Amino acid sequence: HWGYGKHNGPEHWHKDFPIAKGERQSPVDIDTHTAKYDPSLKPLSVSYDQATSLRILNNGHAFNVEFDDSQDKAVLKGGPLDGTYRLIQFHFHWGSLDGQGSEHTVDKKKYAAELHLVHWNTKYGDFGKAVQQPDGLAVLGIFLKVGSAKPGLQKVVDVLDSIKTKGKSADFTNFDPRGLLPESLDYWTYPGSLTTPPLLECVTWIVLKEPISVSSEQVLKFRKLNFNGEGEPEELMVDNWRPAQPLKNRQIKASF
Ligand SMILES: NNC(=O)c1[nH]c2ccc(S(N)(=O)=O)cc2c1-c1ccccc1
Ligand SMILES: [Hg+2]
Numbered sequence: 001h002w003g004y005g006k007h008n009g010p011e012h013w014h015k016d017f018p019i020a021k022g023e024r025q026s027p028v029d030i031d032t033h034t035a036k037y038d039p040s041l042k043p044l045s046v047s048y049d050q051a052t053s054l055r056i057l058n059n060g061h062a063f064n065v066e067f068d069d070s071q072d073k074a075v076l077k078g079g080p081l082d083g084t085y086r087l088i089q090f091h092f093h094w095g096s097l098d099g100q101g102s103e104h105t106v107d108k109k110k111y112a113a114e115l116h117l118v119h120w121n122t123k124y125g126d127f128g129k130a131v132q133q134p135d136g137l138a139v140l141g142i143f144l145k146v147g148s149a150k151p152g153l154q155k156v157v158d159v160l161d162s163i164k165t166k167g168k169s170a171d172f173t174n175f176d177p178r179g180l181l182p183e184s185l186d187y188w189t190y191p192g193s194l195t196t197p198p199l200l201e202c203v204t205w206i207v208l209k210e211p212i213s214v215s216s217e218q219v220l221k222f223r224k225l226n227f228n229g230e231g232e233p234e235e236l237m238v239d240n241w242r243p244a245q246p247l248k249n250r251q252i253k254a255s256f
């Protein structure tokens, strides 16, 4: 099935998922001199104080930290969004080297990794229904650069040993996603898609200008993960990022 390798990677995806060549695919390059400040944007509201993490899973592509979304506990609202979007999970995309790994790029600049906090529009009842709607999802994207360690990330880093291979999961309760945010909530926003198959065009992307810094040892542990299942030949989980897709005269707006 689909992956990130030469034989199942991003330019093979269109065969099983024709929408890969669609009109609002993600990620995209953010050309900072083409993005326009939008005064009609409300401030962004990230309410993660009552977030309830459930567990962490290696899905053979990346790892997901999953949250209980059966109540309004961790919500995204404001900015370009109408109504309330509930946090369901977060995950990352990263490279084999610090000079690559992010999915969105900024004036062609690739970051070492990208964090995606995935939220679904609560007017649709559940995630499965939300992904059938053009405004079903909101993904908050945060760039990672290598520098000082991010203390709020370390609990995630520590558990990765326990979920090395495809299909492995571990209890991951009481994780506070507030520890992953940069200071500034300045952002760019554009309408887009899932960056993974089925590549559904259901996403309002909100990409934060300010990156977080993570340590070299933190990222190195990400790179120790496996794409393969236990007992299979080792295929390191690295370069699990889709490259930038045609903007196709969508408009990227800036909050600042
Ligand atoms: N990880 N399992 C999933 O079902 C999944 N759901 C997603 C929703 C949104 C996005 S996104 N990257 O465009 O923010 C990704 C996912 C995923 C997923 C994420 C990483 C690897 C494989 C699947
Ligand atoms: Hg959709």
Ligand SMILES: [Zn+2]
Pocket: 091, 092, 093, 116, 195
């Ligand atoms: Zn993602």
